């Protein structure tokens, strides 16, 4: 079993009014790549941004791409919780899930908690650790 926490490096909540001009400087490429094409309306999107930094090697260890993670997020929460993400090429494995339709800064934390702990990206729940080996006996 692998939860999002096991493969996550660090999570943070920002106040990003514009997706076009993001708060962070290194995420400005793919975000503006995502937004000009109106697959998903800018107006619908909420100001409050959830940015999670995945570490590369944990993703590779479970052979997990951001595609699978984003699919799992969009399945568990449907379209109510938009998620976007870059390719598996950048030096930092990052994906941004700001809500798109108790205040949203509080709400988004409840969402973040619930995602990190009890969203199942892979495996079977209540199988915590597995060891492979050759039996000498």
């Amino acid at each position: 079993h692998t939860t999002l926490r096991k493969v996550t490096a660090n999570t943070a909540i920002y106040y990003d009014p514009n997706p076009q001009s993001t708060v962070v400087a290194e995420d400005q490429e793919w975000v503006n790549v995502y937004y000009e094409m109106p697959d998903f309306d800018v107006a619908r999107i909420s100001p409050w941004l959830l940015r999670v930094e995945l570490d590369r090697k944990h993703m590779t260890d479970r052979k997990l791409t951001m595609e699978q993670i984003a699919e799992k997020i969009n399945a568990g929460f449907g379209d109510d919780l938009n998620c976007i993400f870059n390719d598996d090429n950048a030096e930092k494995l990052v994906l941004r899930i700001r809500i798109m339709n108790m205040d949203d800064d509080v709400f988004l934390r409840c969402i973040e908690s619930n995602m990190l702990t009890d969203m199942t990206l892979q495996g079977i729940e209540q199988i915590s650790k597995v060891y492979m080996h050759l039996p000498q006996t």
Binding site: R5, T8, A9, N10, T11, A12, I13, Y14, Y15, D16, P17, V23, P47, W48, E53, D55, D103, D104, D105, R109, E112, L116
Partner: protein
């Protein structure tokens, strides 16, 4: 990214909670107790380091060089001051339990430089 600290109101000295102003679409830091407001300079409201990439050098204090029970070594001179001897010890804390990494502290008084090999 870095953590975010709590900020307090300047009238009642209670913590300022986040909120959003729709008619400037800008982040504000407002007190639920009084009716003070501030405009944020951060834009970041919450930060969780699951990896806990903490620099334990910040947790060390130079006074630990005074401990008679810590081991000392002459093989790792200080880059600050050139003092010849230095105490060393392990991380010994939660989320530093992995990795027996040695931290060194200069025993020269008033230098107190700390480092890691």
């Amino acid at each position: 990214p870095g953590f975010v600290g709590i900020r307090f109101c300047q009238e009642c000295n209670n913590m300022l909670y986040p909120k959003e102003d729709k008619e400037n679409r800008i982040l504000l830091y407002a007190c639920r107790n009084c009716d003070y407001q501030q405009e944020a300079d951060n834009s970041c409201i919450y930060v969780n380091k699951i990896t806990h990439e903490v620099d334990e050098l910040t947790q060390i204090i130079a006074d630990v060089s005074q401990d008679p029970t810590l081991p000392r070594t002459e093989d790792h001179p200080c880059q600050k001051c050139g003092h010849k001897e230095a105490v060393f010890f392990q991380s010994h804390s939660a989320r530093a339990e992995d990795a027996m990494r040695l931290y060194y502290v200069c025993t020269a008084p008033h230098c107190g430089h700390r480092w890691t090999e």
